[PDB]
Amino acid sequence: GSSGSSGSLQKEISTEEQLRRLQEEKLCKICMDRNIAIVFVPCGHLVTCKQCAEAVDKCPMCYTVITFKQKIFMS
Numbered sequence: 287g288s289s290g291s292s293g294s295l296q297k298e299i300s301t302e303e304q305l306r307r308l309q310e311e312k313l314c315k316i317c318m319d320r321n322i323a324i325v326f327v328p329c330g331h332l333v334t335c336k337q338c339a340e341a342v343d344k345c346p347m348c349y350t351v352i353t354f355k356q357k358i359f360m361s
């Protein structure tokens with residue numbers, strides 16, 4: 287003889303997964319390791335992070351020479 291039957295209908299996502307969805311959608315796209323905190327000039331494309339942005343001499347998407355490393359403050 288035993289008892290105990292419970293079951294509530296609910297569900298939610300934690301910051302871990304959630305963020306992993308957006309955080310991994312805006313951040314760098316080349317290495318996808320760090321967060322995008324730099325743009326390109328003239329074409330402003332923050333599709334790269336401090337590392338990449340610097341590594342790539344010219345926009346890896348617009349092949350437009352980067353003669354300026356502007357830093358944004360999205361956060």
Ligand SMILES: [Zn+2]
Binds near residue numbers: 335
């Ligand atoms: Zn990167």
Ligand SMILES: [Zn+2]
Binds near residue numbers: 331347348
């Ligand atoms: Zn560009």
